[PDB]
């Protein structure tokens, strides 16, 4: 049924210190290879 | 950084001895030309003045700053070394 009387954004009550970086680590396998500037850094 | 004291030509003479005054320690000189400085618009004017007065002279070419290529955008180069690490 249709309910407009409850808050449905309660998952973040269980988030912790490493939630964001853990999610970032999980996303790594989906990324496309990064482009390259041709050197290790501007100092190479 | 100001460049306004590099507009005109100057004529100066060789530096001679200065010594300490025995009484006060002041800098004494026997050179009457020690403070003499002449201003000229061009090198040619200065050379003509020296020749007619009988002074041997050394002329030195005017040194002009070389034109430079300045680019603010080079500070953030994608792949060059001109990328700055701080602002």
From Swiss-Prot, chain A:
<feature type="modified residue" description="Phosphoserine">
    <location>
        <position position="41"/>
    </location>
</feature>
<comment type="function">
    <text>Accessory subunit of the mitochondrial membrane respiratory chain NADH dehydrogenase (Complex I), that is believed not to be involved in catalysis. Complex I functions in the transfer of electrons from NADH to the respiratory chain. The immediate electron acceptor for the enzyme is believed to be ubiquinone. May be the terminally assembled subunit of Complex I.</text>
</comment>
<comment type="similarity">
    <text>Belongs to the complex I NDUFV3 subunit family.</text>
</comment>
<protein>
    <recommendedName>
        <fullName>NADH dehydrogenase [ubiquinone] flavoprotein 3, mitochondrial</fullName>
    </recommendedName>
</protein>
<comment type="subunit">
    <text>Complex I is composed of 45 different subunits. This is a component of the flavoprotein-sulfur (FP) fragment of the enzyme.</text>
</comment>
Swiss-Prot record, chain B:
<comment type="function">
    <text>Accessory subunit of the mitochondrial membrane respiratory chain NADH dehydrogenase (Complex I), that is believed not to be involved in catalysis. Complex I functions in the transfer of electrons from NADH to the respiratory chain. The immediate electron acceptor for the enzyme is believed to be ubiquinone.</text>
</comment>
<feature type="region of interest" description="Disordered">
    <location>
        <begin position="61"/>
        <end position="87"/>
    </location>
</feature>
<protein>
    <recommendedName>
        <fullName>NADH dehydrogenase [ubiquinone] iron-sulfur protein 4, mitochondrial</fullName>
    </recommendedName>
</protein>
<comment type="similarity">
    <text>Belongs to the complex I NDUFS4 subunit family.</text>
</comment>
<comment type="subunit">
    <text>Mammalian complex I is composed of 45 different subunits. This is a component of the iron-sulfur (IP) fragment of the enzyme. Interacts with BCAP31 and TOMM40; the interaction mediates its translocation to the mitochondria; the interaction with BCAP31 is direct.</text>
</comment>
<feature type="modified residue" description="Phosphoserine">
    <location>
        <position position="85"/>
    </location>
</feature>
């Amino acid at each position: 049924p249709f309910d407009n009387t409850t808050y449905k954004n309660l998952q973040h009550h269980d988030y912790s210190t490493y939630t964001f970086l853990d999610l970032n680590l999980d996303l790594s396998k989906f990324r496309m290879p990064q482009p390259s500037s041709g050197r290790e850094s501007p100092r190479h | 950084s100001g460049v306004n004291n590099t507009k005109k030509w100057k004529m100066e003479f060789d530096t001679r001895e200065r010594w300490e005054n025995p009484l006060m320690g002041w800098a004494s000189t026997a050179d009457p030309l020690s403070n003499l400085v002449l201003t000229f618009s061009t090198k040619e004017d200065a050379v003509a003045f020296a020749e007619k007065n009988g002074w041997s002279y050394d002329v030195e070419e005017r040194k002009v700053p070389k034109p430079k290529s300045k680019s603010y955008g080079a500070n953030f180069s994608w792949n060059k070394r001109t990328r700055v690490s701080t602002k």
